[PDB]
Amino acid sequence: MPELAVQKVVVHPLVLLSVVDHFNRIGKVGNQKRVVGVLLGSWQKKVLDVSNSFAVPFDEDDKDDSVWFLDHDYLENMYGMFKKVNARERIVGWYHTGPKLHKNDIAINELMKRYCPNSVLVIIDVKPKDLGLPTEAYISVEEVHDDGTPTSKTFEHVTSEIGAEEAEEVGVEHLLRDIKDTTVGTLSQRITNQVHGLKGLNSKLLDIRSYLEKVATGKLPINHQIIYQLQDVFNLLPDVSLQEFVKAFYLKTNDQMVVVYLASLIRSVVALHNLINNKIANRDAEKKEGQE
Amino acid sequence: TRPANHRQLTFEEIAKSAKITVNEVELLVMKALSVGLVKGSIDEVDKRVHMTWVQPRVLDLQQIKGMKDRLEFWCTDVKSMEMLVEHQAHDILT
Amino acid sequence: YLMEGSYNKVFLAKGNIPAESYTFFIDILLDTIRDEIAGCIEKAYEKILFTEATRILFFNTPKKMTDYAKKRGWVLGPNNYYSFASQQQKPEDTTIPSTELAKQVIEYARQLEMIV
Known part of the structure; x- marks a missing residue:
């Protein structure tokens, strides 16, 4: 929002498991379907800490977009059922099992808003495939446009991630002793971050390339806004200050080595002293290996 | 028009298309640097202007088709570099 | 003289006459000598007069020196003018390093992570 009352939406693992369990509750022949629940959580700043969620009977036509049903009475019963068990559990939004956005969503956003303003969507996936997080958070804002078109309820993206508690931490810990990820030490861990990062940039850019190629040919009406922003992108690329930048970057590297040199050197001396310690312990073990 | 590192314009190059001598052009750039249509700097002594950022404005279907291949071109740079540190680095480290 | 470019080596190719068989064969080398000399002079100067170039590459005539000022590609103004090919375009790009x-x-990371 323009309001600094929303920004970091942080979903705890048991929610993720909860929507992925809900997606198989319905999952009979009603699968292949958007399923919706309400997000319970707490928050007090630029966060929306999500903690609990429970499916709400939900149906939706598979060719229409004004034929959606959501048992809000069920909500006004359960919401109290869970309040009676934990205070401090308002309704901070509602989740929608992807795979991506539907025109219908905004409609839902106003039958959930009759409880809590600021409600957010949290698109969670039922299929691991993305390499970034399977948790995108949107808000229902509205704006005015330079083209002069009537105000709209759009959806605006806010950064997202998942966090944890000690409880959560420990349960997850326990569940990933099969797929060990701790054998990997620091240095390599961060090299992984820097290759896996390119694995992101690559596919994001790829998606923009498919879009531009989509309007140029195989027509799809142009939306001037996208192309606008897409110009700022190519002005921001680091280029025009080429020579000077070169002469500086080289220098800062030079420093970087100076300190690496020192590091590796001390490391060597210390390890070698370790070796002297082994040799002397071996001589004095050889005086014992004799004797009687 | 100038797309690249080449983003400097010379006073005597602006004046000819703006139809005014080189004593107005100074102020003229300053109104642009004010409203925001331009961000950058005047290098008055050597008669240069530094055009660092210029507001967007609508394009047509023929300019987009060039941007597509300009962006593609960048994509394969990324691909190849990722492929550079999957070999070697990823191989051993993890 | 050959290994460390010193010249006066074309002059000593007719002064090594104490054994005549030397002066018969050594003539071959004199076509490499001219090449190394012009290889350095292509970088060492930028303006000399024409008759001096005739005195340096050990020619007697102007005609020969026209042909050899044509193979290297120089112009024939009042003084024989050079083209900058010493460091025509500098190595001002560490974008070429970049990958390497x-x-x-x-x-380095591999050596600090390997199991030794």
Whole structure:
């Protein structure tokens, strides 16, 4: 929002498991379907800490977009059922099992808003495939446009991630002793971050390339806004200050080595002293290996 | 028009298309640097202007088709570099 | 003289006459000598007069020196003018390093992570 009352939406693992369990509750022949629940959580700043969620009977036509049903009475019963068990559990939004956005969503956003303003969507996936997080958070804002078109309820993206508690931490810990990820030490861990990062940039850019190629040919009406922003992108690329930048970057590297040199050197001396310690312990073990 | 590192314009190059001598052009750039249509700097002594950022404005279907291949071109740079540190680095480290 | 370019080596190719068989064969070398000399002079100067170039490459005539000022590609103004090919375009790009130095960094990491 323009309001600094929303920004970091942080979903705890048991929610993720909860929507992925809900997606198989319905999952009979009603699968292949958007399923919706309400997000319970707490928050007090630029966060929306999500903690609990429970499916709400939900149906939706598979060719229409004004034929959606959501048992809000069920909500006004359960919401109290869970309040009676934990205070401090308002309704901070509602989740929608992807795979991506539907025109219908905004409609839902106003039958959930009759409880809590600021409600957010949290698109969670039922299929691991993305390499970034399977948790995108949107808000229902509205704006005015330079083209002069009537105000709209759009959806605006806010950064997202998942966090944890000690409880959560420990349960997850326990569940990933099969797929060990701790054998990997620091240095390599961060090299992984820097290759896996390119694995992101690559596919994001790829998606923009498919879009531009989509309007140029195989027509799809142009939306001037996208192309606008897409110009700022190519002005921001680091280029025009080429020579000077070169002469500086080289220098800062030079420093970087100076300190690496020192590091590796001390490391060597210390390890070698370790070796002297082994040799002397071996001589004095050889005086014992004799004797009687 | 100038797309690249080449983003400097010379006073005597602006004046000819703006139809005014080189004593107005100074102020003229300053109104642009004010409203925001331009961000950058005047290098008055050597008669240069530094055009660092210029507001967007609508394009047509023929300019987009060039941007597509300009962006593609960048994509394969990324691909190849990722492929550079999957070999070697990823191989051993993890 | 050959290995460390010193000239006066064309002059001593007719002064090594104490054994005549030397002066018969050594003539061959004199076509490489001219080449190395012009190889350095292509970088060492930028304006000399024409008759001096005739005195340096050990020619007697102007005609020969026209042909050899045509193979290297120089112009024939009042003084024989050069073209800058010593460091025509500098190595002002560490974008060319870029990939290579990143390989190296990765390599260090391998030695600090391997199981030894």
